C-alpha cells in the first residue's frame, strides 16, 4: 500500500456556503401605493432595555399543571445511525493540509535538519520543510564547537524572531501597505502561492491568489415597480412617487446585505482557515528549532555542558513572543485582504445590477408623471426634477449597517483609513506592457508607437500610432460632488530657439477623458501645464502651473518633476513636487462625466519632433491631503542608484558635463599648460527675443565615470550610492583622471588632473555619496586613502584661492565640507553638491 496518505480532520477543512443558501426574493416585483411602507429588521436588541422592562415578565398567575391522562400517544420518534469515520480520496493537489504535514516529524527520530524542498520533507523522516530564508535554514543546520554553541543558540533564536517579523515589501515603490511575504511558501494555499515570488504575484492579482475557491455570487435582477393609478387624487400620486424612491433605497440596502452574507460565509471563512494554518505553521517551525537545539546540546560531553549556560524555558519564551508578534501582523494582513475582496471583487458586481434597476425605475417614474400630468396641475415639472435628483446620488456601502460586531467594523474602518485603498487606476510596467494594478481591472491597450522601458517611463510621440487607450470600470461610485485626485511624473522638453512662437502660443492635449462633450483634460502650452474640467452643458474651469523660461538654471525644463491634481467641492488644485502652486474655484460647474475612455495621445497644432515622457500615472477616488502628496513624492523619488541632472539613472561609461549647485554659473576647464581645474563663468543665451533666457550647459570638460574593480554585479552600468569609482575626463584624444595629493596641510587644496598612471604620492579612489535625505539629483564625491580605510580625506568642491601678484577659483578638495554635510536641514547650496549633465535630445543649444 504505497503512496503518501494524510489524515485530515473535517474540522480543519474550509467552510464554503453553497449558492443555494441565499435568497432570491429581490427578483420579485413590488406594487407601490399611496400608503406603501419600507421593511427593515435590525438584528439588534439592547440588553439594558430587556433587563429593566416591566412588561416583559408575566403578571398572570400560572394555571394548575394537573389534567386528564394522555390516551393518544401518536408521535414521530426520530431514528439515528452511525456512518464510517473515514473517507478516502485521491488528489493531485498540494495545498495547506499537505504543506503543514511536511513541517512535522515523528517522536523517535534523532538529528532532524531543515530543508526548502517540499518533496524531500515527505520522503525522508529526518527532513523537515521550512518556509524561512535560505540563510536561516543553513544556520539552523550548522554544527559547531562547544565554546561557540551558546553564541550560535543566541543567534538562531534571534534570527527566528527576525524572520517571523518580516512585514514589508522589498520593492519600496509598489503600492502595498502591509504584507507578510512568507505566507505563500508556508501553505501553498490558493493558486500555487509557494511557486514564484509571492510578493510579486500579490502586486499583480491581490487577495484573490490566496483563495482556494472563487465563489459564484447570487446577484438577482431587481424586479419591476408597479405604480398605482389614483386619477382622482393629486395628493396620493405624489405619495406614490415618494414611496417609489424610498423603496428604491430598500432594494439597494438589501442587495448590499445579500453581498455581505455571501462574503462572510464563502470568503471570510477561507481567510479564517488561513490564519489558523499560519499559527500552526509558525509553531511547527519553533518546535523543529527547539528539537535541533536540544539534540545538539546533548552530543557534547558532560563536562562541556558546564561551560555552556542555556535556559530552555527562556528559549521557548523568546520564540513564543516572536510568534505572537508575527500573528498580529498576519491577522492584519489577512483581514485587509478579506475586506479588499469584498470591496473590489464583490460589491461592484452588485452596483452594476443596481444602477441597471435605477435606470429602469427612472424610465418608469418619468412615464408615470407624464401619464398623470393633467391631474398634477402643472406641478408635474417639480416632480420630474425630484426624480432625476434622487436617482443621481447612489447609496454608499457601509458595513456597520449590516453588523454590530466590533471586529468587523474595525477591519472596515482600518481599510477606509489607508490611502492606497483609494487608488482606482494604477498604470505600471510588467513584461513589455502597461497594466492596471489598482485591483479594479481596467482595460489597457498600448499601440506600437509608445516606447516603454523597465524604469516605468513611457514616451508619447507625434506619430499616429503613439497612443494608449484605458477603458475604466463603470461600476466604481462622484458626478456632481467631485472628490478625486490624479498624480504622475513628467519630463517636458525645452523650446526650440528658432520656433519660440509655435511653442508659446499653441496648446496641445496629452491626456483626454471625455464622453458626450464632458469630462477632464490635461494639456500643455509651451511652459504651462493645464488641468481642465468640462460639464454636460459645455462649461469650463481651469487651474494651471507655469514655470519660468527666463532662468539661468531651471529646475523644471527637461527635468523630471512630480504633478498632483486635486478636486473637491470648492477647489481644483495643482501641487508640484509636494507643494501647493495654484488654486481655482469650481462651484459654478455642475455634473462632470469622469467615466469616459482615457486617451494618452498628443493632439493639436504640434511640431513633428514634439514628444513627452511620463511615469507612474494613477487616479485616486478621494481628495489627497498635502501629507499624502508629499509622502508620495518621497516614496516615488527613492532609488538604490544615483540620478543625473535630468533625473534619469546615473551611468558608468557615459559622457557627462559637470554642474555645481553652490556655484551654479561656473564650470570646470583644464588650465593652459598646467594640470589643475580652472573655474570660468557659463556663457549665456546669445541674441534676439525678450521672452527667453538661459545659461549654456554643454560646456567645460567632458567627464566620464569608471568603476574600480570588475569583481562585482556586472549586470548593468548603473552607479549606486557608496560605490567606489575613478572620475575621468577627455583631453583631446586620451582619457585623463582626477587625483588628490597625499599631503594636505591646509584646509583647501587644488586637485591634480593628469593621465592614467599608477603613482605613489597621489590617491585616485573616490566614493560617490548622497548626504541629502530629501529628494535631490545632487551627489557628493569623497576621497580616501584606499577602499578599506575608515579615514576620509575631504570632499571635492570649489574654493577661491589667493595667489600673489608681482584671487582665482579652482577645482579643489576641502575639509570644511565634511563638517557641514551632516547638519539638520542640509544645505542644498553647498559647493560639494555636484550633478552630471549628459547630452539629451530634449535640450538643444
Amino acid at each position: 500500500a504505497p503512496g503518501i496518505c494524510i489524515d485530515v480532520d473535517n474540522e480543519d477543512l474550509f467552510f464554503i456556503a453553497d449558492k443555494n443558501s441565499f435568497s432570491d426574493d429581490l427578483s420579485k416585483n413590488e406594487r407601490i401605493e399611496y400608503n406603501t411602507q419600507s421593511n427593515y429588521i435590525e438584528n439588534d436588541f439592547p440588553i439594558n432595555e430587556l433587563i429593566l422592562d416591566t412588561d416583559l415578565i408575566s403578571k398572570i398567575e400560572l394555571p394548575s399543571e394537573n389534567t386528564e391522562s394522555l390516551t393518544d400517544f401518536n408521535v414521530d420518534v426520530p431514528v439515528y445511525e452511525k456512518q464510517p469515520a473515514i473517507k478516502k480520496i485521491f488528489t493531485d493537489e498540494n495545498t495547506i493540509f499537505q504543506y503543514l504535514y511536511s513541517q512535522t516529524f515523528p517522536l523517535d527520530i534523532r538529528d532532524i535538519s531543515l530543508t526548502s524542498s517540499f518533496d524531500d520533507a515527505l520522503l525522508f523522516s529526518n527532513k523537515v520543510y521550512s518556509f524561512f530564508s535560505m540563510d536561516y535554514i543553513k544556520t539552523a543546520n550548522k554544527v559547531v564547537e562547544a565554546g561557540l554553541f551558546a553564541g550560535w543558540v543566541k543567534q538562531i533564536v534571534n534570527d527566528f524572531v527576525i524572520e517571523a517579523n518580516k512585514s514589508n515589501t522589498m520593492d519600496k515603490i509598489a503600492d502595498i501597505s502591509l504584507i507578510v511575504p512568507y505566507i505563500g511558501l508556508a501553505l501553498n494555499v490558493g493558486n500555487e502561492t509557494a511557486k514564484g515570488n509571492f510578493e510579486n504575484a500579490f502586486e499583480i492579482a491581490g487577495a484573490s491568489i490566496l483563495l482556494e475557491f472563487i465563489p459564484e455570487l447570487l446577484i438577482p435582477v431587481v424586479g419591476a415597480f408597479l405604480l398605482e393609478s389614483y386619477i382622482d387624487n393629486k395628493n396620493k400620486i405624489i405619495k406614490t412617487i415618494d414611496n417609489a424612491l424610498t423603496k428604491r433605497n430598500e432594494k439597494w440596502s438589501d442587495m448590499y446585505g445579500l453581498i455581505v452574507a455571501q462574503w462572510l460565509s464563502t470568503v471570510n471563512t477561507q481567510f479564517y482557515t488561513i490564519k489558523e494554518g499560519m499559527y500552526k505553521a509558525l509553531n511547527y517551525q519553533a518546535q523543529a528549532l527547539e528539537e535541533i537545539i536540544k539534540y545538539r546540546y546533548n552530543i557534547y560531553s558532560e563536562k562541556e555542558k558546564s561551560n555552556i549556560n542555556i535556559d530552555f524555558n527562556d528559549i521557548n519564551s523568546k520564540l513564543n513572543e516572536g510568534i505572537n508578534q508575527a500573528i498580529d501582523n498576519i491577522n492584519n494582513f489577512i483581514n485587509g485582504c478579506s475586506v479588499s475582496y469584498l470591496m473590489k471583487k464583490m460589491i461592484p458586481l452588485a452596483v452594476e445590477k443596481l444602477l441597471d434597476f435605477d435606470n429602469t425605475l427612472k424610465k418608469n417614474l418619468l412615464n408615470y408623471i407624464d401619464e398623470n400630468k393633467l391631474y398634477l396641475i402643472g406641478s408635474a415639472e417639480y416632480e420630474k426634477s425630484k426624480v432625476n435628483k434622487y436617482l443621481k446620488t447612489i447609496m454608499p456601502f457601509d458595513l456597520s449597517i449590516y453588523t454590530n460586531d466590533t471586529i468587523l467594523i474595525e477591519m472596515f474602518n482600518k481599510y477606509n483609513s489607508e490611502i492606497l485603498n483609494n487608488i482606482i487606476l494604477n498604470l505600471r510596467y510588467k513584461d513589455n506592457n502597461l497594466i492596471d494594478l489598482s485591483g479594479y481591472g481596467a482595460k489597457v491597450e498600448v499601440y506600437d508607437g509608445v516606447e516603454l522601458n523597465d524604469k516605468n517611463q513611457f514616451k508619447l510621440t507625434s506619430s499616429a500610432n503613439s497612443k494608449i487607450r484605458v477603458t475604466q470600470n463603470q461600476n466604481i461610485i462622484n458626478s456632481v460632488f467631485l472628490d478625486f485626485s490624479v498624480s504622475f511624473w513628467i519630463r517636458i522638453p525645452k523650446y526650440k530657439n528658432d520656433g519660440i512662437q509655435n511653442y508659446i502660443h499653441n496648446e496641445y492635449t496629452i491626456i483626454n477623458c471625455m464622453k458626450n462633450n464632458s469630462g477632464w483634460k490635461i494639456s500643455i502650452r509651451g511652459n504651462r501645464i493645464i488641468w481642465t474640467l468640462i460639464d454636460i452643458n459645455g462649461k469650463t474651469k481651469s487651474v494651471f502651473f507655469e514655470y519660468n523660461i527666463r532662468e539661468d538654471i531651471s529646475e523644471y525644463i527637461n527635468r523630471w518633476f512630480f504633478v498632483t491634481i486635486t478636486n473637491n467641492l470648492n477647489n481644483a488644485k495643482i501641487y508640484i513636487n509636494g507643494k501647493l502652486e495654484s488654486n481655482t474655484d469650481i462651484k459654478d460647474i455642475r455634473e462632470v462625466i469622469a467615466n469616459g475612455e482615457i486617451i494618452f495621445k498628443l493632439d493639436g497644432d504640434i511640431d513633428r519632433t514634439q514628444f513627452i515622457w511620463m511615469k507612474y500615472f494613477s487616479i485616486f477616488n478621494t481628495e489627497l491631503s498635502q501629507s499624502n502628496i508629499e509622502e508620495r513624492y518621497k516614496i516615488q523619488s527613492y532609488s538604490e542608484y544615483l540620478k543625473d541632472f535630468w533625473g534619469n539613472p546615473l551611468m558608468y561609461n557615459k559622457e557627462y558635463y559637470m554642474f555645481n549647485a553652490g556655484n551654479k554659473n561656473s564650470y570646470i576647464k583644464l588650465k593652459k599648460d598646467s594640470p589643475v581645474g580652472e573655474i570660468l563663468t557659463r556663457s549665456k543665451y546669445n541674441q534676439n527675443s525678450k521672452y527667453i533666457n538661459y545659461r549654456d550647459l554643454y560646456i567645460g570638460e567632458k567627464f566620464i565615470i569608471r568603476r574600480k574593480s570588475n569583481s562585482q554585479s556586472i549586470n548593468d552600468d548603473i552607479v549606486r550610492k557608496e560605490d567606489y569609482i575613478y572620475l575621468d575626463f577627455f583631453n583631446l584624444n586620451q582619457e585623463w583622471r582626477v587625483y588628490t595629493y597625499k599631503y594636505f596641510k591646509k584646509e583647501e587644496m587644488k586637485l591634480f588632473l593628469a593621465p592614467i598612471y599608477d603613482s605613489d604620492e597621489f590617491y585616485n579612489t573616490i566614493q560617490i555619496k548622497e548626504y541629502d535625505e530629501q529628494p535631490t539629483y545632487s551627489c557628493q564625491l569623497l576621497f580616501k586613502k584606499d577602499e578599506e580605510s575608515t579615514d576620509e580625506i575631504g570632499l571635492i568642491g570649489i574654493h577661491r584661492f589667493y595667489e600673489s601678484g608681482i584671487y582665482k577659483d579652482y577645482f579643489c578638495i576641502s575639509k570644511w565640507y565634511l563638517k557641514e554635510v551632516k547638519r539638520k536641514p542640509y544645505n542644498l547650496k553647498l559647493g560639494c553638491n555636484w550633478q552630471f549633465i549628459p547630452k539629451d535630445e530634449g535640450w538643444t543649444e
Binding site: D673, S674, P675, V676, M749, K750, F752, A754, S759, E803
Partner: peptide, 18 residues
Amino acid sequence: KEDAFSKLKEKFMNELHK
C-alpha cells in the same frame, strides 16, 4: 613615456606652493 607625468607633477607642486 613616463617623463610627461613628472613634468606635470612639478607644475602641480609649483601651483600648490603658489
